[PDB]
């Protein structure tokens, strides 16, 4: 396969503006399906799957290569260079918000704006920083994942969706069960260990921070931290949608905020 084929790159929509939708761990590009109707008549929308998606051939997940977020940034930049659509708006959920931040420091030319959903530069607390997780706290999650993947997904998918939206629990269960458990564990440990705090000030592009409500992974205080520390023009939108996956659980409401955050 080419890189574009391996990571299931898709370009949809009729417009001149370019929008990139980049999913998080545990999902794949189909997490955007109910957002697409709101953008495809005036954007060319680029979708792709992260290499850890269960929709990507598990042969591609090379543990020697994918040891830091920078190897994920390599793949994003390689796709955007291959598609040659030029300057774009980039929407990143959870790990893809971090991937977008780092890509925008390497290649600010490529990004008109970043729209960050569920963004965190560091999950672990540090001396005078609140990520949400104390030393040792995550261990019970990675123990449960390794001990009984299916029991772990059955309890975690409702928690991540947050709101009582059976269809979202279905979709997120489907994309967690499609992942190979050793990949889910490895990538979840790598992302949980990430720390982007020291590069936020190097961002130069505008950012909209769409801050999830009652997200297990990101305290509501994070939005203020990103507004203070991101180096470009940053705006905060506190979502009135519950949970980690607002694009699955309340696509209409999330799409209306995304549209409000577009550059011009
Ligand atoms: Mg600045």
UniProtKB/TrEMBL annotation:
Sorted UniProt keywords: Hydrolase, Metal-binding
Highest rank taxon of the organism: Eukaryota
Residues given in the record as Mg(2+) binding sites: 231
GO MF annotation list: hydrolase activity; metal ion binding
Coiled coil feature spans: none
One family name in Pfam for this protein: Abhydrolase_6
Domain AB hydrolase-1: 19-256
Family designation: Belongs to the AB hydrolase superfamily.
Protein name: D14
The organism of origin for this protein: Striga hermonthica
